[PDB]
Amino acid sequence: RQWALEDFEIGRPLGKGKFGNVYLAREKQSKFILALKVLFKAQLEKAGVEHQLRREVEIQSHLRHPNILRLYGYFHDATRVYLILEYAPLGTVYRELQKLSKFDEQRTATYITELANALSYCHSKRVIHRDIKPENLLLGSAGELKIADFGWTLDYLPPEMIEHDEKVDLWSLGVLCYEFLVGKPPFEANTYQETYKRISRVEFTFPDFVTEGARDLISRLLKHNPSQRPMLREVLEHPWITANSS
Numbered sequence: 001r002q003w004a005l006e007d008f009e010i011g012r013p014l015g016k017g018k019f020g021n022v023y024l025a026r027e028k029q030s031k032f033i034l035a036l037k038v039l040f041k042a043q044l045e046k047a048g049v050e051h052q053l054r055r056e057v058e059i060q061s062h063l064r065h066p067n068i069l070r071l072y073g074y075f076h077d078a079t080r081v082y083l084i085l086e087y088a089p090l091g092t093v094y095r096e097l098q099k100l101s102k103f104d105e106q107r108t109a110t111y112i113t114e115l116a117n118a119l120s121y122c123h124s125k126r127v128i129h130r131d132i133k134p135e136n137l138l139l140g141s142a143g144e145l146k147i148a149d150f151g152w153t154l155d156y157l158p159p160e161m162i163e164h165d166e167k168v169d170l171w172s173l174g175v176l177c178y179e180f181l182v183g184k185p186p187f188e189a190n191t192y193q194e195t196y197k198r199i200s201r202v203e204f205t206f207p208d209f210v211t212e213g214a215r216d217l218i219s220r221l222l223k224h225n226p227s228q229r230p231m232l233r234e235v236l237e238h239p240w241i242t243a244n245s246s
């Protein structure tokens with residue numbers, strides 16, 4: 001597949017991202033709407049992530065789940081690098097959260113399900129993320145979660161990763177479920193030093209409205225020791241999840 005800028009019509013900007021802007025785009029050849037991201041070699045090289053881009057781009061190129069933002073392909077030219085992505089209309093979970101303040105059990109439980117489902121999928125292919133934050137979570141037309149973290153902020157980093165295998169993403173689901181119901185990440189502090197401290201000591205408390213079913217599931221996810229964290233299956237089978245998911 002030989003792709004090229006000339007193969008798309010560029011529409012409105014879709015905001016800025018680390019290392020380049022994303023644009024709404026339509027394939028002249030297909031009329032198909034999607035998202036185009038432009039990255040600059042110079043900025044990628046400068047700061048050492050040019051190896052990650054290929055590494056993840058390659059891996060991300062083989063994932064196929066309704067809850068994983070798809071990458072139909074990539075290409076470059078002399079100075080820039082282009083990623084062709086699926087277009088998620090409803091924005092980022094991070095935006096919806098600060099708009100709504102927080103999510104109720106139904107919304108949370110349904111997102112966690114979708115998240116656990118994509119992660120289950122990724123596991124069978126030995127694919128882990130190592131950093132799942134709300135701003136990298138996009139929403140489709142039916143409001144379904146779409147992970148756009150070409151996996152392969154200390155707020156969403158597990159202890160073993162700041163002091164690992166696929167146990168990391170369980171800790172990820174733990175942080176997210178909390179942030180969704182409560183409106184903020186569990187180890188969030190005023191200093192970056194105390195956040196590091198809170199994460200390592202795994203100390204968080206729940207606001208009175210968070211239910212027991214939710215506390216159980218989160219308390220089992222946020223374990224300092226990774227082997228003690230449940231498995232995706234257990235999560236998707238959790239009583240709280242099952243009773244509140246769409």
Ligand SMILES: Cc1cc(NC(=O)c2cccc(C(F)(F)F)c2)ccc1Oc1ncccc1-c1ccncn1
Pocket residue numbers: 014015016017018019022035037039044049050052053056083085086087088089091135136137138148149150151
């Ligand atoms: C979320 C996202 C992540 C990447 N991520 C990378 O390109 C990337 C991944 C891994 C590593 C790196 C490295 F290393 F260069 F830093 C970069 C690229 C495009 C992305 O989508 C958007 N971003 C900003 C605004 C809007 C969207 C969007 C897309 C589709 N529909 C609706 N909105």
